Every structure is written in C-alpha cells, then in structure tokens.
Amino acid sequence: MDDLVFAGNKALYLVLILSGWPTIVATCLFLLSGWYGEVLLSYGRQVIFLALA
Amino acid sequence: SSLSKHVDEGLDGYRDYLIKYSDRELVQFFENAPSIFALLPAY
C-alpha cells in the first residue's frame, strides 16, 4: 500500500504548494496560468503509471 | 462459411466507414495481440 500512501500524500502536498502559493504572494495571472497545468498534467501522467502497472 | 461468405462482402460498406474515422494506432493494436470485431472498440 506504499503506492497508495505516496499517491495519497502527493495530493495533499500539491494542495499546500499550488493553492497556497498565491496566498503568500497576494498577502498578475498570466504567469500563474501556465504553471498549474504543467503540474496537474504531470501528476496525472504519474498516477496512471502507478495505476495500470 | 459458404453462405457466410456472402455477408463479409455485404459489410464492406460499413468497413470502409470504420477506417476513415478511427485511428490506425488503435486499429492494428486489437489485431496483432482489418477485422470487423477489431475496429468497433477503436472507432
């Protein structure tokens, strides 16, 4: 269940990084538009390699 | 398969239709592991 733990904690790690980065920034949207689709598409690219294999 | 050799030519009009709108990276993939049963899960 280690691949269930690693995939279950990379989601909470990305919520802290991605949703919490313009919290500390705003405390400009075109530079933050291209960053989020790179990480979500790569995390979905990784979770199928951990799923179907 | 004698009078079953009549229908394989009858489905040719549906078979030229199932190649134009399906990709040929999925057409041969359900074959090497064009057939009439090997193109419906890809179309």
Binding site: L4, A7, G8, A11, L14, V15, L18, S19, G20, P22, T23, A26, Y36, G37, L40, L41, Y43, G44, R45, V47, I48, L50, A51, L52, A53 | L26, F29, F30, N32, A33, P41
Partner: protein
C-alpha cells in the same frame, strides 16, 4: 471476482485523486477574489476535462487494461 472488485476499486480510486486537487485549486482562487457566493462547479468542470483530453486518458486506460492481460 472478489479480487477483481478490490483491484477495480483501487484503480478507480487512483483516478479520483488528481481531480480532488483540481477542485480546491478553483475554490482557492475564487476565495482569493470576492466571489465567495459564486459556486465553483461552473469553473472547475472546464479544467477537469481538458486535463483528461490533453492526457487523452481514453486511450491510456484502454491500452493499459489490455496490457494487464494480453501481450503483443
């Protein structure tokens, strides 16, 4: 069939995990602006299905479940 429903719920949970993050990255920016009454389901649903077509998962799941049994 018991080990097949267990494996189907494990693969089915794997798919579930990325979207959950997709949801709170919409409600975070909507709470960052003054749109606290606006519901996020009209903005989260557009970026839920472009992550699925750029990854084109209809071919990725269909090739992977065949490759778990068959061979080329």
């Amino acid at each position: 069939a018991l080990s097949e429903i267990k494996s189907a719920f494990k693969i089915g949970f794997y798919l579930y995990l990325p979207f959950v993050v997709v949801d709170l990255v919409v409600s975070s920016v909507l709470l960052a602006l003054g749109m606290m009454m606006m519901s996020p389901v009209t903005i989260s649903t557009p970026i839920k299905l472009v992550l699925f077509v750029a990854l084109d998962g209809w071919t990725l799941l269909s090739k992977g479940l065949i490759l778990q049994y068959m061979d080329i």
